[PDB]
Amino acid sequence: NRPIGSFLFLGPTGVGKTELCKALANFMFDSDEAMVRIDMSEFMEKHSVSRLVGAPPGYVGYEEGG
Amino acid sequence: QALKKYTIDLTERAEQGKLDPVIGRDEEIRRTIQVLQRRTKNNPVLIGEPGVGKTAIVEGLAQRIINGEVPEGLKGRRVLALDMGALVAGAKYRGEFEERLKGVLNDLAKQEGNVILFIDALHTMVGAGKADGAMDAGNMLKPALARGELHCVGATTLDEYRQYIEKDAALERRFQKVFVAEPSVEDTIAILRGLKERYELHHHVQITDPAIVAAATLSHRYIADRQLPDKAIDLIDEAASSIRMQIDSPEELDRLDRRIIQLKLEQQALMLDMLNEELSDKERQYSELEEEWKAEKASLSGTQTIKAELEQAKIAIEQARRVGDLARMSELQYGKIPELEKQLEAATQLEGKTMRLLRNKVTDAEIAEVLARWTGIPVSRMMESEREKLLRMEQELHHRVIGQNEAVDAVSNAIRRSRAGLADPNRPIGSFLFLGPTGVGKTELCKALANFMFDSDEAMVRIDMSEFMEKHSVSRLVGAPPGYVGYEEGGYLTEAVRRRPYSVILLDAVEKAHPDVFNILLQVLDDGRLTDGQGRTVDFRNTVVIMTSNLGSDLIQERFGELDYAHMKELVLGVVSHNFRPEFINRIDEVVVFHPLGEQHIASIAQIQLKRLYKRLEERGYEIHISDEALKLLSENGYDPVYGARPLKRAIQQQIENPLAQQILSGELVPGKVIRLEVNEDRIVAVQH
Amino acid sequence: DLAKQEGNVILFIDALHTMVGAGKADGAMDAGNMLKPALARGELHCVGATTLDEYRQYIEKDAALERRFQKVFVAEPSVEDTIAILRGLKERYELHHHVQITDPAIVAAATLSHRYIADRQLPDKAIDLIDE
Numbered sequence: 030n031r032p033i034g035s036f037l038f039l040g041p042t043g044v045g046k047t048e049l050c051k052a053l054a055n056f057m058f059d060s061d062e063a064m065v066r067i068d069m070s071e072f073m074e075k076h077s078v079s080r081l082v083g084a085p086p087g088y089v090g091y092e093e094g095g
Numbered sequence: 096q097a098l099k100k101y102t103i104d105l106t107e108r109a110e111q112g113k114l115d116p117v118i119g120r121d122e123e124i125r126r127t128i129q130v131l132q133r134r135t136k137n138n139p140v141l142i143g144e145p146g147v148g149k150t151a152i153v154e155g156l157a158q159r160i161i162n163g164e165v166p167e168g169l170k171g172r173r174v175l176a177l178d179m180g181a182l183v184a185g186a187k188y189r190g191e192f193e194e195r196l197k198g199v200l201n202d203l204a205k206q207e208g209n210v211i212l213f214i215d216a217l218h219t220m221v222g223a224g225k226a227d228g229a230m231d232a233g234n235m236l237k238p239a240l241a242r243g244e245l246h247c248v249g250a251t252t253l254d255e256y257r258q259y260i261e262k263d264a265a266l267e268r269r270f271q272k273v274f275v276a277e278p279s280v281e282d283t284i285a286i287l288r289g290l291k292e293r294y295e296l297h298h299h300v301q302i303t304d305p306a307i308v309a310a311a312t313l314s315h316r317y318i319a320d321r322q323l324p325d326k327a328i329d330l331i332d333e334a335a336s337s338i339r340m341q342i343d344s345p346e347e348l349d350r351l352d353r354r355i356i357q358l359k360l361e362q363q364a365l366m367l368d369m370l371n372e373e374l375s376d377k378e379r380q381y382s383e384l385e386e387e388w389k390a391e392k393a394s395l396s397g398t399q400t401i402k403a404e405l406e407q408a409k410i411a412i413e414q415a416r417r418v419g420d421l422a423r424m425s426e427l428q429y430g431k432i433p434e435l436e437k438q439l440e441a442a443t444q445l446e447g448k449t450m451r452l453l454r455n456k457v458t459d460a461e462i463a464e465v466l467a468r469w470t471g472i473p474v475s476r477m478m479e480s481e482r483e484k485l486l487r488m489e490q491e492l493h494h495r496v497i498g499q500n501e502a503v504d505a506v507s508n509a510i511r512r513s514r515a516g517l518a519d520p521n522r523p524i525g526s527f528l529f530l531g532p533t534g535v536g537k538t539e540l541c542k543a544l545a546n547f548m549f550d551s552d553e554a555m556v557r558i559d560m561s562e563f564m565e566k567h568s569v570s571r572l573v574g575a576p577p578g579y580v581g582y583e584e585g586g587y588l589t590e591a592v593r594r595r596p597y598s599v600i601l602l603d604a605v606e607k608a609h610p611d612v613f614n615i616l617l618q619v620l621d622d623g624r625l626t627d628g629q630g631r632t633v634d635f636r637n638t639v640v641i642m643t644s645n646l647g648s649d650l651i652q653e654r655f656g657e658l659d660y661a662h663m664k665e666l667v668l669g670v671v672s673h674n675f676r677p678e679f680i681n682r683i684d685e686v687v688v689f690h691p692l693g694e695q696h697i698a699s700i701a702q703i704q705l706k707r708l709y710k711r712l713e714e715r716g717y718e719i720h721i722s723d724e725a726l727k728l729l730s731e732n733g734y735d736p737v738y739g740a741r742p743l744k745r746a747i748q749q750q751i752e753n754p755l756a757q758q759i760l761s762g763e764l765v766p767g768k769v770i771r772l773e774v775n776e777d778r779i780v781a782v783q784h
Numbered sequence: 785d786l787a788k789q790e791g792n793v794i795l796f797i798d799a800l801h802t803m804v805g806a807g808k809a810d811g812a813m814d815a816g817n818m819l820k821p822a823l824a825r826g827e828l829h830c831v832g833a834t835t836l837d838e839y840r841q842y843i844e845k846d847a848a849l850e851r852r853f854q855k856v857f858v859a860e861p862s863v864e865d866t867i868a869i870l871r872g873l874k875e876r877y878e879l880h881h882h883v884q885i886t887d888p889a890i891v892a893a894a895t896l897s898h899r900y901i902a903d904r905q906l907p908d909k910a911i912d913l914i915d916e
C-alpha cells in the first residue's frame with residue numbers, strides 16, 4: 030500500500046545527497062540519470078502543481094498529462 | 096489476391112538482401128516471439144520513443160525467420176507488411192474499404208496461421224475510414240484480433256500511443272506491449288559496426304573504428320534532442336557524405352582553373368608577352384593535377400569495388416551456409432577471403448601513399464566536424480587560426496576591456512578549458528559571479544566575450560535580473576505551466592537556449608531580483624538541466640553563465656588599496672555570504688572581484704572611446720585628430736572613484752560632441768578637411784585645416 | 785512516380801508545417817503518416833523550409849516526423865553579406881524599376897535597415913528599403 034521507500038535526505042550542502050541518488054540510479058538501471066528527476070525549485074508558486082499532475086479537463090494541456 | 100495488392104513482403108526483402116542487419120536486441124525478439132505464439136492476443140505492439148529500434152525489431156524478426164535462428168513454430172512464417180495508405184487510397188465509394196479489409200482478413204484465414212501481419216504505425220489504424228457510413232477499421236479488427244486468428248505486430252511511438260490507442264480501451268487491451276527501451280552506448284557501438292559494413296558499401300568510403308566509438312560517445316554527449324542509436328548513425332552517414340563530397344572535388348583545381356581563365360582573359364585582352372609562357376606552365380601544372388586526381392579516382396573506385404566484391408563473397412558464403420554446398424564452402428573461404436583481403440590492404444597502403452591533392456577515410460576529425468556543424472557547439476579539433484586566436488584570448492579581450500587583469504585571466508582560462516576538453520561534462524562551462532563597483536567593465540567584459548566568441552555583441556541570451564523583483568520571475572523564464580495562459584509559447588531562457596546550445600547567458604545585475612529567484616539557478620549551475628513548463632528538459636551543459644552583481648561596492652572601493660587580491664576575494668565573499676544563501680555561492684565557479692579604476696586606465700578608455708567616435712564620424716564622412724593636451728584634460732576631468740568609467744563617457748560626450756554638434760549643424764565644418772581638437776583655455780576648439 | 789525516377793528528383797516542400805497536418809480529415813491518413821514510412825528509408829529526397837516558431841509548434845509536436853528531418857540552421861546574415869546580396873539584387877531591381885542605384889545607397893540601406901527597423905530581419909528589410 031506504499032512505495033518501497035520515501036526518504037527525506039537532510040544535511041548541509043556538498044556532502045552527497047544528489048550523488049547518492051544518482052548512485053542509486055546508476056546501480057539499479059545501469060545509467061546515471063535514468064530516473065524521474067523533478068526539480069522542486071520550480072514550484073515556488075502555488076499554481077505550478079499542475080506541471081506534475083497535469084491539466085484539468087477543458088484547459089490547455091489536457092491532452093498531455095503531467 | 097488481396098495480399099498481392101495491399102501488402103509488401105518482408106521475408107522477400109530479407110531473402111534478397113535488401114534489409115539492414117539487426118544486431119543486439121535479444122530480449123525483445125524473444126519476447127515478440129513469445130507474444131506471437133499464444134492462442135489469444137497474438138498482438139505485440141512495440142512501444143518505445145521513436146528511433147530506438149522498433150521497426151528494426153520487425154526487420155530482425157524477418158531476418159531471423161529467413162536464417163532460421165527461431166524456434167520451430169515460426170519456421171516458414173511469412174512476414175507480410177501492411178500499409179494503410181494502400182488500403183484507403185482507392186476507397187472512393189461506400190464500403191470499398193470494408194470490402195478490401197474483409198478480403199485481407201479472409202485471405203489471411205486461408206493461410207492457417209502462416210502469415211505474421213505487420214502494421215507499421217499502429218497508432219494510425221484507430222479510425223482509418225471514419226465517415227458517415229463507416230466501420231472505423233478498428234471495429235473490423237476488434238473481432239479478428241479478439242479471437243487470436245490474426246498475428247498482427249504493432250510498431251508505434253509512445254506519445255502516439257497515449258494520444259491514439261489509450262483513448263480507446265477496447266483496442267488498447269487487444270494488444271500486448273513490448274517496451275523497447277533506449278539502447279546503451281556499448282550496444283550502440285555494436286549497431287554501428289554492422290552498419291559500418293553497410294554504409295561503407297554504399298557511400299564508397301572506409302569508416303575507421305575510432306570514428307565509431309567517438310561518434311557514439313560524442314553523440315550521446317552533445318545532441319540531446321533526439322534519441323540513440325539514431326543520432327550516431329546520423330553523424331556517421333553525414334560524415335561519409337562529407338568525405339565523398341571532398342573526394343568528388345578538390346580546391347587547388349578551383350584556384351588553378353580560375354587562375355588560368357583569368358590569365359587567359361588578360362592575355363586575350365592584351366592581344367612584352369610572358370603570359371603565354373606563364374599560362375602554358377599553369378596549364379601543364381593543371382593537367383598534372385587533373386591526371387593525378389583521375390588516378391586517385393580510379394584507385395579509390397577499384398578499392399571500393401573490390402571491397403564490394405569481398406562482401407559479395409560473404410553474402411555467397413552465407414547463402415552456402417543456408418543451402419549446404421560442399422566444395423563451395425572451403426572454395427569461397429580459403430580462396431576468396433584472404434587474397435581479396437590482402438589486396439584490399441595493398442590498395443589501402445597504395446591510397447595511403449598516393450592521396451595528396453587529403454582525407455579519404457571517415458575518421459574522428461570528420462565526426463567532430465559534423466557534430467560541430469549539427470548543434471552549434473565547438474566540438475571540433477582546432478585550426479591554427481582559431482588556436483592562435485584562442486591563445487591571444489587575454490590580448491583580444493584587452494582590445495575592449497582595458498583594466499581588470501583578474502577576470503580576463505579567469506574567463507580566458509574557462510573558455511580554454513572548454514576547448515581543450517577538460518570541462519566537467521555535467522556542469523556548464525563557466526558559472527561566474529562578476530562583482531565590483533558601479534561601472535568598471537562587467538557588462539563590457541561579457542560583451543567582449545560575445546564579440547570574441549560569436550563576432551557580435553547582440554548574440555547573448557541576456558536575462559535582465561532587475562525585472563525580477565517578484566516570483567513572477569520564475570514564471571517568466573521557465574514558461575507557463577499547463578492549464579495556464581502562455582503554455583503555447585514557453586519561457587524565454589529555455590527556448591532561447593535550446594535554439595543555440597552554446598551561448599553566453601548573462602544575468603545582468605543579479606542582486607536586484609527577489610532572493611528566492613536564485614533557485615532556478617541551483618538547477619542550472621548544478622547540472623545544466625532546466626525543465627520548462629511544456630515539460631521537457633533543456634541542456635545547459637554548453638553555456639557560459641555570467642552573473643554581474645555589485646554587492647560589495649563600498650567594501651571594494653574602501654579597501655582595494657593596501658590589500659592583496661586573495662583577502663579581498665575572501666572578504667567580499669563574506670559579504671556575499673550575508674546576502675545570498677550558502678546553497679548558491681557553493682555552485683559558482685569563481686567569484687571574481689573587480690576594482691576601481693586608476694588614471695592611466697581612464698586615459699586608455701578615453702582612447703578607446705575616441706576610436707569609436709572617429710569611427711562614427713568616418714561613417715558620417717569626417718576625420719578628427721586630437722591634441723594630447725585635450726586627452727590630458729579629458730583624463731583629469733574624468734577621475735572619481737565612486738562612479739568608475741561613465742564619468743569619462745559623459746565628459747567625452749559633453750566636452751567634444753556638444754560643440755562639435757553645434758558646429759556640424761552650423762554648416763561650418765566642411766567634410767573632407769581634417770579636424771584638429773586643440774585645447775582652448777579650458778574648452779576644446781575645432782578648426783578646419 | 786518519384787520512386788520510378790530512380791532518385792533523380794529532389795523534392796522541395798516549403799512550409800513543412802503545412803505538410804504535418806495536411807489532409808487530416810475525420811480520422812484518415814494525412815500527408816504526414818503516408819510520407820512517414822517513405823522518408824526514413826531515403827526513397828524520397830525532400831527539402832523542407834520552415835519558420836522556426838512553426839517548427840516548434842507544428843513539427844516538434846509530432847516527434848516521429850521530427851526525427852525524419854535534419855535541422856539546418858540558417859542564421860540572419862551579417863551586414864557585409866547583406867551588401868553583397870543587395871548588389872546582385874541591385875542588378876535585378878535596376879532591370880525592373882527603370883532606375884539606377886548607387887553603392888552609397890546600398891551601404892546606407894544596409895546600415896540604416898539594421899540599426900533602426902527592429903521588427904523584420906536582414907536581408908529582407910534592406911531589400912524592402914531598396915524596392916520602396
Ligand SMILES: Nc1ncnc2c1ncn2[C@@H]1O[C@H](COP(=O)(O)OP(=O)(O)OP(O)(O)=S)[C@@H](O)[C@H]1O
Nearest residue numbers: 041042043044045046047048049621677678679681
Ligand atoms: N560524499 C561525496 N562523495 C563523492 N562525491 C561527492 C560527495 N559529496 C559531494 N560530491 C560531489 O559534489 C557534487 C554533488 O554535490 P551534492 O552534495 O550532491 O550537492 P547537494 O547534495 O545537492 O547539496 P546541495 O543541495 O547541492 S548544497 C558532485 O560533483 C560530486 O562529485
Ligand SMILES: Nc1ncnc2c1ncn2[C@@H]1O[C@H](COP(=O)(O)OP(=O)(O)OP(O)(O)=S)[C@@H](O)[C@H]1O
Nearest residue numbers: 115116117118119145146147148149150151286848
Ligand atoms: N538495434 C538495431 N540494429 C540495427 N539497426 C538499428 C538498430 N537500432 C536502430 N537501427 C537503425 O536505425 C534506423 C531507424 O531505426 P528505426 O527502428 O527504424 O526507428 P523507428 O523504428 O522507425 O522508430 P519510428 O517510431 O518508427 S520513426 C535504421 O537505419 C536501422 O538500421
Ligand SMILES: Nc1ncnc2c1ncn2[C@@H]1O[C@H](COP(=O)(O)OP(=O)(O)OP(O)(O)=S)[C@@H](O)[C@H]1O
Nearest residue numbers: 495496497498533534535536537538539645700740
Ligand atoms: N577596462 C575597460 N575598458 C573599456 N571600457 C571600460 C573598461 N572598464 C569600464 N569601461 C566602460 O565602462 C562603461 C560602463 O561599464 P558597464 O559594464 O557598462 O557598467 P557595469 O559594468 O554593468 O556596472 P554596473 O554596476 O552594471 S553600472 C562601459 O561602457 C565601458 O565602456
